[PDB]
Amino acid sequence: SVIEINDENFEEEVLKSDKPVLVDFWAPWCGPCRMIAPIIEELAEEYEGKVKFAKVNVDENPETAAKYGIMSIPTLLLFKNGEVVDKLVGARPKEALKERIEKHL
Numbered sequence: 001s002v003i004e005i006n007d008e009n010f011e012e013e014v015l016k017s018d019k020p021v022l023v024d025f026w027a028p029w030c031g032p033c034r035m036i037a038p039i040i041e042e043l044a045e046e047y048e049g050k051v052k053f054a055k056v057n058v059d060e061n062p063e064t065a066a067k068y069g070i071m072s073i074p075t076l077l078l079f080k081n082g083e084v085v086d087k088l089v090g091a092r093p094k095e096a097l098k099e100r101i102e103k104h105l
Contacts, residue, residue, distance in 0.1 A: 002044050002053045007063040014054060015082040020104050021052045022097070025068075025075045027059045032091035033074045039094045043101070051101060080104050 005013050005023075014021045024040050026033035044053040058065045058073060068077060068084065078086040078100060086100045 001048075002040060002055055005054045005056055007061045010056070010061075010064050013052075014079055017052055017079070019050065019052055020085075020101070021054055021079045022101065023054045023056060023077045023079065025056050025058055025065065025070045025073050025077070027057055027073055029059075030073050036074055036076075036091050039097065042094060043097060047101065050105065078104060 002024075003013065014023060022040070022043070024033075024036070026037075040053055040055070043051075047053075056064055058070060064070075068075075072089055074089075074091055076088040076092075076097065077084050085104055088097070088100065
């Protein structure tokens with residue numbers, strides 16, 4: 001399943017994760033975020049146990065946004081071993097995200 005994370009637990013849950021983490025930076029007012037949400041849901045089921053999926057609401061988490069220069073949403077950062085290993089700005093199809101995830105497995 002998808003997890004909601006925030007300024008407080010980001011380090012432990014994302015940077016210290018023992019598997020790849022896809023982090024979806026979103027906000028309630030962003031239409032396209034709502035468009036990719038069911039996609040993020042589909043992927044989390046397909047990759048249960050292999051990849052971790054997280055959401056950060058940028059309206060409540062300025063520090064985490066700033067720390068990665070998030071200025072537009074949606075933005076999807078893929079992390080592995082504490083490092084950002086891919087970055088997608090803008091809504092994208094399931095297949096576009098699957099491809100980037102697959103590259104890092």
